[PDB]
Design a protein around this motif. Structure first.
Motif, PDB file in Angstrom:
ATOM      1  N   UNK A 117       0.856  -1.225   0.000  1.00 23.70           N
ATOM      2  CA  UNK A 117       0.000   0.000   0.000  1.00 23.70           C
ATOM      3  C   UNK A 117       0.877   1.255   0.000  1.00 23.70           C
ATOM      4  N   UNK A 118       1.977   1.225   0.702  1.00 22.21           N
ATOM      5  CA  UNK A 118       2.872   2.418   0.755  1.00 22.21           C
ATOM      6  C   UNK A 118       3.419   2.705  -0.639  1.00 22.21           C
ATOM      7  N   UNK A 119       3.768   1.677  -1.361  1.00 24.09           N
ATOM      8  CA  UNK A 119       4.315   1.865  -2.733  1.00 24.09           C
ATOM      9  C   UNK A 119       3.258   2.545  -3.601  1.00 24.09           C
ATOM     10  N   UNK A 120       2.028   2.125  -3.473  1.00 26.76           N
ATOM     11  CA  UNK A 120       0.925   2.731  -4.279  1.00 26.76           C
ATOM     12  C   UNK A 120       0.751   4.198  -3.887  1.00 26.76           C
ATOM     13  N   UNK A 121       0.690   4.468  -2.610  1.00 21.81           N
ATOM     14  CA  UNK A 121       0.529   5.873  -2.132  1.00 21.81           C
ATOM     15  C   UNK A 121       1.788   6.661  -2.473  1.00 21.81           C
ATOM     16  N   UNK A 122       2.914   6.006  -2.433  1.00 19.16           N
ATOM     17  CA  UNK A 122       4.206   6.682  -2.725  1.00 19.16           C
ATOM     18  C   UNK A 122       4.171   7.259  -4.140  1.00 19.16           C
ATOM     19  N   UNK A 123       3.610   6.534  -5.066  1.00 19.01           N
ATOM     20  CA  UNK A 123       3.546   7.022  -6.474  1.00 19.01           C
ATOM     21  C   UNK A 123       2.857   8.386  -6.503  1.00 19.01           C
ATOM     22  N   UNK A 124       1.828   8.551  -5.718  1.00 20.02           N
ATOM     23  CA  UNK A 124       1.101   9.853  -5.683  1.00 20.02           C
ATOM     24  C   UNK A 124       2.001  10.921  -5.060  1.00 20.02           C
ATOM     25  N   UNK A 125       2.730  10.564  -4.040  1.00 22.23           N
ATOM     26  CA  UNK A 125       3.629  11.545  -3.360  1.00 22.23           C
ATOM     27  C   UNK A 125       4.635  12.088  -4.373  1.00 22.23           C
ATOM     28  N   UNK A 126       5.139  11.232  -5.213  1.00 22.53           N
ATOM     29  CA  UNK A 126       6.130  11.662  -6.237  1.00 22.53           C
ATOM     30  C   UNK A 126       5.464  12.648  -7.197  1.00 22.53           C
ATOM     31  N   UNK A 127       4.251  12.361  -7.593  1.00 23.77           N
ATOM     32  CA  UNK A 127       3.531  13.255  -8.548  1.00 23.77           C
ATOM     33  C   UNK A 127       3.537  14.684  -8.010  1.00 23.77           C
ATOM     34  N   UNK A 128       3.237  14.842  -6.755  1.00 18.79           N
ATOM     35  CA  UNK A 128       3.235  16.197  -6.138  1.00 18.79           C
ATOM     36  C   UNK A 128       4.652  16.762  -6.149  1.00 18.79           C
ATOM     37  N   UNK A 129       5.618  15.930  -5.880  1.00 16.75           N
ATOM     38  CA  UNK A 129       7.035  16.393  -5.845  1.00 16.75           C
ATOM     39  C   UNK A 129       7.420  16.981  -7.202  1.00 16.75           C
ATOM     40  N   UNK A 130       7.144  16.269  -8.260  1.00 21.22           N
ATOM     41  CA  UNK A 130       7.481  16.771  -9.622  1.00 21.22           C
ATOM     42  C   UNK A 130       6.664  18.024  -9.915  1.00 21.22           C
ATOM     43  N   UNK A 131       5.426  18.027  -9.509  1.00 19.88           N
ATOM     44  CA  UNK A 131       4.550  19.205  -9.764  1.00 19.88           C
ATOM     45  C   UNK A 131       5.126  20.427  -9.052  1.00 19.88           C
ATOM     46  N   UNK A 132       5.452  20.282  -7.796  1.00 25.18           N
ATOM     47  CA  UNK A 132       6.016  21.419  -7.014  1.00 25.18           C
ATOM     48  C   UNK A 132       7.392  21.792  -7.563  1.00 25.18           C
TER      49      UNK A 132
ATOM     50  N   UNK B 272      10.939  26.676   1.845  1.00 24.59           N
ATOM     51  CA  UNK B 272       9.499  26.912   1.544  1.00 24.59           C
ATOM     52  C   UNK B 272       8.916  25.692   0.835  1.00 24.59           C
ATOM     53  N   UNK B 273       9.612  25.181  -0.137  1.00 24.21           N
ATOM     54  CA  UNK B 273       9.105  23.999  -0.897  1.00 24.21           C
ATOM     55  C   UNK B 273       8.720  22.888   0.079  1.00 24.21           C
ATOM     56  N   UNK B 274       9.474  22.724   1.126  1.00 25.26           N
ATOM     57  CA  UNK B 274       9.169  21.656   2.119  1.00 25.26           C
ATOM     58  C   UNK B 274       7.825  21.946   2.782  1.00 25.26           C
ATOM     59  N   UNK B 275       7.616  23.166   3.189  1.00 31.49           N
ATOM     60  CA  UNK B 275       6.335  23.528   3.863  1.00 31.49           C
ATOM     61  C   UNK B 275       5.161  23.357   2.903  1.00 31.49           C
ATOM     62  N   UNK B 276       5.307  23.825   1.697  1.00 31.82           N
ATOM     63  CA  UNK B 276       4.204  23.706   0.699  1.00 31.82           C
ATOM     64  C   UNK B 276       4.042  22.245   0.283  1.00 31.82           C
ATOM     65  N   UNK B 277       5.131  21.581   0.010  1.00 34.93           N
ATOM     66  CA  UNK B 277       5.072  20.148  -0.401  1.00 34.93           C
ATOM     67  C   UNK B 277       4.527  19.298   0.747  1.00 34.93           C
TER      68      UNK B 277
END
Length: 108
Positions: free
Chosen positions: A43-58, A86-91
């Motif tokens: 489950x973490x791997x699946x959720x992790x994929x979404x976390x990366x999407x935000x990282x690239x977006x930010x 700042x990126x850390x706080x927003x991300x």
């Protein structure tokens, strides 16, 4: 297995000789830590994929690294490298909101 919690913090790290070989990304203001947990690694791997999407977006061409995780770890340790704090706080704000789904009220 007590119902009531009781974690002993007191002294931590330092002179802990925790590890000796360098492999993780050097800590700094351009580095952020991420802590995610769920049913298991799958489950973490699946959720992790979404976390990366935000990282690239930010931040474009965002770089990240994940330390060793067991199948029953229930927790995932990952780090992200940006350019400013700042990126850390927003991300982190959006990342936590994504998992905590604090945006909008109930689905129905």
């Amino acid at each position: 297995m007590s119902n009531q919690t009781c974690v002993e913090n007191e002294v931590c790290e330092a002179c802990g000789c925790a590890g000796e070989i360098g492999f993780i990304i050097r800590e700094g203001d351009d580095v952020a830590e991420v802590s995610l947990f769920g049913s298991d690694k799958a489950h973490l791997e699946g959720k992790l994929a979404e976390y990366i999407s935000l990282a690239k977006q930010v931040y474009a061409n965002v770089e990240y690294e994940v330390a060793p995780v067991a199948d029953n770890a229930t927790e995932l340790h990952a780090r992200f490298k940006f350019e400013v704090s700042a990126e850390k706080l927003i991300f982190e704000l959006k990342t936590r909101a994504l998992a905590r789904l604090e945006h909008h009220h109930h689905h129905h």
